[PDB]
Amino acid sequence: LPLVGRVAAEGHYQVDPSLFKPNADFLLRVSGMSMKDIGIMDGDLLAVHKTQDVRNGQVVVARIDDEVTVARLKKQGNKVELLPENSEFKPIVVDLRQQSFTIEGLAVGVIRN
Amino acid sequence: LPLVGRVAAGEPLPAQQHIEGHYQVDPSLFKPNADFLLRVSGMSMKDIGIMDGDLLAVHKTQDVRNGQVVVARIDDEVTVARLKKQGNKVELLPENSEFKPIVVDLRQQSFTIEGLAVGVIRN
Amino acid sequence: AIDENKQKALAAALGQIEKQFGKGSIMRLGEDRSMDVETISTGSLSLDIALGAGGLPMGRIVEIYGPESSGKTTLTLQVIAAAQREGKTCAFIDAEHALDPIYARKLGVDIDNLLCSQPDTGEQALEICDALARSGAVDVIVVDSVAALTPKAEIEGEIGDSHMGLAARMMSQAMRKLAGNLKQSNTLLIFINQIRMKIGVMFGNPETTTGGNALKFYASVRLDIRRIGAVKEGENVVGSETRVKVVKNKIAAPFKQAEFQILYGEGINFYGELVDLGVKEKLIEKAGAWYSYKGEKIGQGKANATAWLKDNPETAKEIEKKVRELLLSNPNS
Amino acid sequence: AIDENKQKALAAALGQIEKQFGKGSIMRLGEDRSMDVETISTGSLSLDIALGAGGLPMGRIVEIYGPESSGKTTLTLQVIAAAQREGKTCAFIDAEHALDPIYARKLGVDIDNLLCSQPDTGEQALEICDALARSGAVDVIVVDSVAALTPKAEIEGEIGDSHMGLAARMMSQAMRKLAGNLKQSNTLLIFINQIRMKIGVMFGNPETTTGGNALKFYASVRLDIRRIGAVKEGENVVGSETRVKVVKNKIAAPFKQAEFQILYGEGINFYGELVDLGVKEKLIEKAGAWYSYKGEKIGQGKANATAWLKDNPETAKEIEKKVRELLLSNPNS
DNA sequence: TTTTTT
Ligand SMILES: Nc1ncnc2c1ncn2[C@@H]1O[C@H](COP(=O)(O)OP(=O)(O)OP(O)(O)=S)[C@@H](O)[C@H]1O
Ligand SMILES: Nc1ncnc2c1ncn2[C@@H]1O[C@H](COP(=O)(O)OP(=O)(O)OP(O)(O)=S)[C@@H](O)[C@H]1O
Ligand SMILES: [Mg+2]
Ligand SMILES: [Mg+2]
């Protein structure tokens, strides 16, 4: 499973893709401390399944204006909330009329070294 | 890396070496190399990211120091917590405000360290 | 219409089975008096309370195991003595060749009426137990240290020869041949087990027991007896503080544990357990170390209370009756 | 009525077992003279008193262990010499390859009548022990340093290879095969053991004996022998003060301890035991540093009093007869 | 099934 950079929250790791549902496609290092309430910590690898269509409630890996992030998706018309899991942080409101918002895949597992 | 039972993240529970399955994870990814996996059951260790239901990778050792996160067994009941040894008393501190440290009277109770926590894998 | 035909067919099948296999072959469970559980004393009131039913069941298989000098043989000889005090016949298959008749006599065992056998092989031991069970004239048989039940091939073999699971296979065959015989004869078989360490266990307790897995499945009650302290008379260790944990129970709730004292040359301290349980049931007032019964200060400390109780048998009998009435989960008839 | 039927069935069962397995296969414990415990001197009067029965039980298993240079080999050689003084035959399975015939002869052992063997593997040592036991001509066997009882696979293998508890399996199989032979043959087997550290123990005394848990369960008597100080003739260290704690006893009360002096070139200082045990029983008056006997001031200082005891055999005979009468709790004759 | 090792 390939590692292709970090996440605003290098090597091939011998991890079975089938362990995740849906199957993980690639792993991302985590840089940040905002995903802590649901167990995603700084430095871990989060698993992503390459897809384009998701619904509300899932924790998703989004790309907002070429910047990568992970948060819980809440879609309401042309307004998206990438809710974080932390008291010290504030949610990132994507006004879906001026910013390009691309779903990259689903967070399906975490791995700590 | 085999899964060989559950470990209590809270009040210790009796656990047995039942090999539920073998997971395709490179043991070398953890330092030191993980020896087995345990299904976490509880939320006393969630502050560091060890949540209920995830697999704590454990490296089988018998010697650990203070401040490490270890998998201990008191009177045939296993638990995971941060160790603090002072003579004939032991403290398995959790990582949670809602939980209290578990004192082991090391004069009446059998206490055996069963490894060291070296990482977490969640499905 | 249909239910009448079903009842007729069921009655015909029942009569056919009784004709083929005997009168007691098949019958309704609620009218089968042979399946009732009859319990026998363990020589320890706390252990009787822990077992739930009031002692070890009759006609079953019971395992007792623990580390070295934990009190397995002494507890067993107390059971045998309690059995003989009611007129029952008991047998001891000493496979360790480590039975002391004088010490057995000191515990209350009538040596002149105890059948003792020192078998050469495990097959001979298990066959002796089988014959004693089939006789129906022996109520309790104990087998010392099923870790000493060495197969005939292993005895005839050489040291370092590999007999992979031969003892386990022999133990399984013996349990298969003995369960029904013991049930039929209403005979209690107590297997004493030794503790070994299992290698390669990565998690949990490495302590296993000898004899394979068949004894685990076929034993109705399994006891883990351990030495948890020393009863010292200042500088002389005069007894052992022993804890027995009921790891398996088929006749009551499991995992209850008991604590008592084994005094060398006297056996289980019945009066100490009695005083402790009377205190537990608010029948003996314990102000610090002061024990009193109905206001009358019986003494100070466990030893003094035990001595006073021994000097006053009537209060001992009264407190024992009360404790048996209250704390027993499954009071025997 | 039913009692007579029970007695008849019991008699039939005893007849069946007796015909099947042998004359002495099963019989009541009271009339089994083969189960009587008969003991031999250990070379130390204090140790005989501490053991309770007056010595080490024949036909049983004894494990003696302690730290380095604590006197285990010297103690077992003294036992061998005491046995040989009674016409018995003894064997020394020297597994450590560290036996000195000159020192053994110095301690009183008749070297010409000691069957000394130096096994190449642990299996060879245990097969020799089994052959000696089955022969019936050897009354004492001493297996030196069961830590040196290395399995054959460990010998053929290379250093650094892991043999996960192979010697434990070998020792368990040996004890299984050997307990019955030793009991039938009336042979005392003394296993000398070493002491190793327990890695990562939490509570207390991380001491462990080599060879596994089988010897703990099977040894009738277990001794912890330690050196506690030196005995000096001025500034020359001429002996060692040794304390033996009976950690496990199956023939008498355990946990009693004894203290003696091992003099280099003489072994156990018997007369020092005699003096101390006479003082303990008021047979010898002790006024400060002066010892007197029946008014006669016999000396000052322990060494000079024991030298007196050397000088006159008569009073030594008197006092040893008396102390053996008053302190030996289980006299045979 | 069988057994600890420092
Ligand atoms: N003849 C005896 N006189 C007095 N105390 C004894 C005697 N024999 C054993 N004991 C002690 O009584 C207690 C009960 O132990 P036992 O039941 O005899 O041994 P065990 O529990 O069967 O374990 P094993 O099989 O000997 S390793 C122990 O503390 C023994 O040391
Ligand atoms: N040939 C000898 N002459 C005199 N003293 C000796 C001799 N060999 C050993 N000793 C000492 O006598 C005491 C008894 O020790 P040993 O007889 O060697 O038995 P041990 O205590 O088991 O020592 P081991 O077997 O070598 S670990 C010790 O203090 C030895 O140093
Ligand atoms: Mg026993
Ligand atoms: Mg030696």
Side-chain angles (χ1 to χ4, degrees), chain C residues 69, chain D residues 50-53 55 57 219-222 246-255:
Chain C
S69 276
Chain D
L51 282 169
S220 287
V221 186
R222 304 215 318 139
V246 189
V247 288
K248 182 200 190 208
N249 210 345
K250 270 174 133 136
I251 56 167
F255 294 131

Side-chain angles (χ1 to χ4, degrees), chain C residues 66-76 96 98 100 102-104 106 144-145 192 194 225 227 239-240 262-266, chain D residues 216-219 247-255:
Chain C
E68 89 283 5
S69 276
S70 59
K72 305 187 295 286
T73 301
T74 293
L75 173 71
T76 297
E96 267 179 19
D100 189 45
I102 298 314
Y103 186 60
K106 270 184 215 189
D144 225 19
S145 291
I192 291 181
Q194 296 178 2
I225 172 162
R227 207 191 93 107
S240 146
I262 298 169
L263 302 178
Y264 306 148
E266 322 166 0
Chain D
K216 300 182 205 310
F217 285 92
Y218 264 108
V247 288
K248 182 200 190 208
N249 210 345
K250 270 174 133 136
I251 56 167
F255 294 131

Side-chain angles (χ1 to χ4, degrees), chain B residues 50-107:
Chain B
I50 304 172
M51 306 263 273
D52 169 80
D54 67 46
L55 306 172
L56 172 54
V58 190
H59 173 226
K60 177 73 148 84
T61 79
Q62 258 293 188
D63 67 300
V64 295
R65 57 170 181 284
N66 273 25
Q68 283 180 305
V69 171
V70 300
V71 183
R73 195 225 313 138
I74 85 186
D75 270 353
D76 285 14
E77 272 184 354
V78 67
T79 181
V80 50
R82 227 174 259 281
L83 186 88
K84 204 193 101 194
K85 164 183 51 73
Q86 273 155 7
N88 83 41
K89 66 203 151 283
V90 191
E91 281 90 42
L92 277 158
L93 318 169
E95 290 280 41
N96 188 329
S97 197
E98 293 297 325
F99 278 72
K100 342 283 171 55
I102 298 194
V103 313
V104 188
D105 163 46
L106 211 59
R107 259 193 115 187

Side-chain angles (χ1 to χ4, degrees), chain C residues 66 94 96-97 99-101 111-112 114 116-118 135 137 147-148 154 158-159 161 195-196 199 264, chain D residues 6 9 13 21 25 27-30 35 37 123 127 130 164 172-173 176-177 180 183 217-218 248 250 255:
Chain C
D94 154 27
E96 267 179 19
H97 297 84
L99 187 54
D100 189 45
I111 45 177
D112 277 75
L114 180 103
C116 199
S117 180
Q118 284 176 145
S135 162
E154 156 150 272
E158 214 177 320
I159 304 267
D161 279 9
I195 273 185
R196 297 289 191 276
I199 309 196
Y264 306 148
Chain D
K6 281 190 77 193
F21 305 123
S25 86
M27 52 181 314
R28 321 237 177 222
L29 188 54
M35 292 218 76
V37 173
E123 271 90 29
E127 81 166 31
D130 273 297
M164 266 338 278
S172 201
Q173 176 176 7
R176 263 199 321 259
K177 287 184 78 261
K183 176 52 73 88
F217 285 92
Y218 264 108
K248 182 200 190 208
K250 270 174 133 136
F255 294 131

